[PDB]
Ligand binder design. Sequence first.
Ligand SMILES: NC(=O)c1ccc[n+]([C@@H]2O[C@H](COP(=O)([O-])OP(=O)(O)OC[C@H]3O[C@@H](n4cnc5c(N)ncnc54)[C@H](OP(=O)(O)O)[C@@H]3O)[C@@H](O)[C@H]2O)c1
Ligand SMILES: O=C(O)Cc1ccccc1
Length: 314
Amino acid sequence: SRLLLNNGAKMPILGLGTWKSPPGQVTEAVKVAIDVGYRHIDCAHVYQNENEVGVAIQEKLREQVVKREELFIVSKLWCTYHEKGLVKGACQKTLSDLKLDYLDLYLIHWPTGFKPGKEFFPLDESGNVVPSDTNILDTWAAMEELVDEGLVKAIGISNFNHLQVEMILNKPGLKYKPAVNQIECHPYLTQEKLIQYCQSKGIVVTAYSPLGSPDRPYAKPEDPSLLEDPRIKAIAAKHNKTTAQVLIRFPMQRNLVVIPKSVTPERIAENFKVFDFELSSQDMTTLLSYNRNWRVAALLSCTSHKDYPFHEEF
Ligand SMILES: NC(=O)c1ccc[n+]([C@@H]2O[C@H](COP(=O)([O-])OP(=O)(O)OC[C@H]3O[C@@H](n4cnc5c(N)ncnc54)[C@H](OP(=O)(O)O)[C@@H]3O)[C@@H](O)[C@H]2O)c1
Ligand SMILES: O=C(O)Cc1ccccc1
């Protein structure tokens, strides 16, 4: 039900994602989620809805439905705030929008640093993304002091390949190990090598886009759909469960934290009923065989960035 992190904290294996969740629908979505039983919410400054997520959290706290210690709130540092002096300020902005005094987990959203400014994806006259000269090690040291100041209880990373994780682990004077590495994971991108590597170093893996993210903006009619895969429908039918429920239970049995997104009350409730059944070892091996190495989030505009994470095998 909860996984143990290297800072001694317990992280709910199931959480609610908020990317693409409209500001006018997410407050109600988070409220319903908390009522249903969710104790983990995944957020990010770049989602432009943290203020609205925060309204939900504050309402449930005032209502006594949950106490702060029961909730596990996660947010992420955007690429335009990688410089030393900007990290504390970005965390503080997120804390105010969410209306909390500490975050349970703060992740470096992407290993790529962009030029600071108002634009999330700063461009030049040619049209490509302008990088920052900062590196992963300097940004990590800034994340470490947020723990020393009490702003966050744990720090982690997101979309980091194995070599980038190595860099941090082998950094001189390392004070806090990354507690979590949140990566894209589902049956079409199983990530067996990155997962095995992270797990061997005591780093918890969080799987994002577990349903294949059918609502991504760059969606094409010829792209593969997990929710409609006949082979996955068969396994679901065999268990008297929905395909989404199977796609959510899949990573849990691999000892991964899963964070499916939804703004629909019935779906939010449906996605929660995944603790009452088990996928057989055969079901797990079969699902793993469906890997096509297909990524939903490839950050294609940063293919030339010095820190792009997807050139390495894992
Ligand atoms: N760290 C990173 O770089 C990063 C990147 C991507 C995502 N994430 C996190 O991962 C979270 C989840 O990934 P995601 O948002 O890309 O997509 P996802 O959870 O894989 O899929 C969300 C989509 O599936 C639909 N859905 C949810 N439950 C369903 C069900 N039971 N039956 C049918 N359809 C269902 C949702 O529709 P409705 O909402 O309409 O119900 C929505 O369209 C994000 O919100 C975010 O918090 C992190
Ligand atoms: O990185 C993410 O979580 C998804 C995302 C893609 C493009 C713009 C904002 C967020």
